[PDB]
Design an enzyme around this catalytic site. Structure first.
Site, short mmCIF file in Angstrom:
data_model
loop_
_atom_site.label_atom_id
_atom_site.label_comp_id
_atom_site.label_asym_id
_atom_site.label_seq_id
_atom_site.Cartn_x
_atom_site.Cartn_y
_atom_site.Cartn_z
CB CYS A 149 44.23 40.68 45.09
SG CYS A 149 44.57 40.91 43.32
CG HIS B 261 40.52 41.32 40.60
ND1 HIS B 261 41.47 41.21 41.58
CD2 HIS B 261 39.61 40.37 40.86
CE1 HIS B 261 41.14 40.25 42.41
NE2 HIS B 261 40.00 39.71 42.00
CB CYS C 28 45.69 42.88 41.00
SG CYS C 28 44.12 43.78 41.03
ZN LIG Z 1 43.06 42.44 42.58
#
Ligand SMILES: [Zn+2]
Ligand SMILES: Nc1nc2c(CCNCC3CCCCC3)c3[nH]c(NCCc4ccccc4)nc3cc2c(=O)[nH]1
Ligand SMILES: Nc1nc2c(CCNCC3CCCCC3)c3[nH]c(NCCc4ccccc4)nc3cc2c(=O)[nH]1
Ligand SMILES: [Zn+2]
Lengths: 344, 344
Positions: free
Chosen positions: A280, A311, A282
């Site tokens: 991820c 998230h 993010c």
């Molecule tokens: Zn994340």
């Protein structure tokens, strides 16, 4: 840009990827549309009509100005939420809201994508009941259409989507699609699912229901869903999604990952230094570990839930980007299979 | 940079402005030190020693790594919070924590500014009781000193602050300052205030108490306070502050402004399009109005409280920057007066 244009840039089986163009911006499809409290966000018609009131939001300059979002906004028509959160029904509407008032409210809020006022039939429903409900929604669809067309600022700058009902019955889904296409909308939603039926049944209904809608217009699956719901729905020709799950999950300690959802409060994460998800991109995963987010949430810190929420929102947009690229590249069916192998 | 150096760049009456230099960074004074869950943040010794435990935070790499903060961190010694949140006392310490264990825990957490283990005397207190309590804290101060000096990594890389007690009595504040100076610390806190005494009494005690500390070292007023508390304390020679108010206020609907605090949930803000504060450069005020933050908080949206919290944190840092510049420019007494005229 135009008021509304939908163009499909690539296909793979039933799946499609492309773009919606509107005056406030472009929406890449398949699209996840998060609640705004992304290329488009969802406003909360039911809530706003009660607090502070649609007229007041208008007085305050419309939802774009209110929420500091200058890109497209979609609003639902409110009846779903009235029926599940508010009720007396009539052919006129719901007392607890009619097609005309729904459209007016959505106009006052200034949303770019307006939903017709429908009835999300309860599940399970008998064929007769499903039919009666669907038939009413189609009369309400025409009323919605007319109401929308009567307001010039709305008709020239926003778009209107029709909503298919019919419960789980093929013949009624067909009649509904027929009535909606005859009236004519900018886009078509598949309503009346994610009402308790379970994934197998939802997929079974989508298998015959989505090809009944105009192929050259976007298909919106309302209230769906988990990551694996979305992938399967895109496989079946859905282009647009909304779901409270990512934000509710994030308030309740649940995080989505490529390896499946995790409950971050569980003690197994208290010393886990990996980010929420390893891939991820993010901001949350760029900076903080599962152990710290665990700590925050167990301590009742609002920061923890905000980090979890961010998230999850980002995870969902990463999922949609991966779906879009793979369809574009002709490898969506492999992605789907790889996705499910790892997620489950 | 060195382990610790304090330099005063400008003075105005009792007020000072300057810098603390430490290996992880520079702290501009007067400084507001927010809780990290700014040039320095506060860790939560009491909480961390219970969850996940100091040893575990160490196993996880220390608080800097845990919280993703590479700048200085201050930790309190924990007894304040034990006495008010946990209790059996002895000369050894508190059962519910001793000087040595407190210092060890703060070492395990890896904080840069370590507080000696003291007793925050209850208010009100008789002279005899205040004296007995203060005397114990000074023995605990020496123990803290020794414990800190016994750990080489700590003694060479962190700093240790002594905490003055004595309740509201001048002679005891003096004896306490005397004992602390004799032991020798990197900095001196004024403890035992913000315990229910009220602003006039707190100021009266600071008037005689702060000149008793070494002038060439920083002065930390623990647990203080509202914007107007801080301005008055800086007038009286305080250099460092911590207070949960900005973060608790922000969770409870209260925002600090140059015109005083406001309760954003009140209906008067529902259509107020001004930002939280008109001058505030914070990100929140750059983008959203009182009306939207009102909306979010009334709806129970976690976003609203996060936005309020960020604003309050930023407001506090803006206040400290304005205090620093005015002292530097020789116009702090005018700022103070202008500040109070508008705030009240
Ligand atoms: Zn994340
Ligand atoms: N007109 C209309 N709306 C529907 C909605 C609301 C979509 N989300 C609106 C959005 C507006 C802003 C506030 C939030 C909602 C549905 N939601 C679901 N499933 C949710 C099932 C679910 C999944 C996860 C968590 C809770 C519930 N099925 C739905 C069917 C319909 C329908 O036929 N017609
Ligand atoms: N060693 C020590 N600590 C004290 C503390 C804790 C300072 N904040 C720590 C910080 C660590 C991280 C978690 C949060 C606390 C105090 N806090 C207050 N007033 C608060 C009065 C107040 C003001 C606004 C809201 C609530 C309470 N007086 C204090 C006196 C002492 C003292 O003599 N010795
Ligand atoms: Zn602000």
């Amino acid at each position: 840009r135009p008021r509304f244009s939908f163009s499909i840039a690539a296909r793979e089986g039933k799946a499609r990827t492309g773009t919606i163009e509107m005056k406030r911006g472009v929406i890449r499809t398949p699209a996840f549309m998060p609640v705004g409290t992304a290329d488009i966000i969802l406003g909360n018609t039911y809530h706003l009509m009660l607090r502070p009131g649609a007229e007041r939001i208008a007085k305050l300059g419309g939802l774009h100005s209110f929420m500091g979002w200058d890109r497209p906004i979609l609003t639902d028509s409110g009846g779903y939420q009235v029926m599940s959160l508010s009720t007396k029904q009539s052919e006129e509407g719901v007392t607890f809201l009619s097609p005309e008032r729904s459209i007016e409210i959505q106009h006052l809020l200034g949303s770019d994508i307006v939903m017709a006022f429908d009835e999300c039939t309860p599940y399970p429903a008998t064929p007769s009941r499903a039919a009666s409900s669907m038939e009413r929604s189609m009369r309400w669809a025409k009323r919605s259409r007319d109401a929308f067309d009567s307001r010039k600022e709305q008709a020239e700058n926003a778009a209107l989507f029709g909503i298919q009902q019919g419960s789980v019955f093929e013949n009624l889904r067909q009649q509904s699609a027929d009535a909606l296409a005859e009236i004519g909308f900018d886009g078509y939603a598949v309503g009346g699912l994610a009402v308790g039926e379970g994934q197998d049944e939802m997929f079974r209904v989508l298998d015959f229901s989505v090809p009944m809608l105009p192929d050259d217009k976007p298909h919106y699956l309302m209230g769906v869903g988990k990551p694996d719901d979305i992938v399967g729905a895109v496989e079946r020709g859905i282009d647009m999604f909304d779901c409270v799950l990512p934000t509710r999950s994030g308030r309740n300690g649940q995080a989505f990952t490529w390896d499946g959802p995790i409950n971050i409060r569980n003690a197994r994460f208290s010393e886990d230094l990996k980010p929420l998800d390893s891939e991820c991109h993010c901001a949350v995963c760029q900076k903080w570990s599962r152990a710290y987010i665990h700590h925050l949430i167990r301590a009742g810190e609002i920061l923890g839930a905000m980090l979890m929420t961010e998230h999850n929102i980002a995870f969902y947009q990463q999922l949609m980007q991966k779906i879009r690229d793979s369809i574009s590249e002709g490898r969506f069916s492999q992605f789907a299979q790889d996705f499910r192998a790892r997620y489950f």
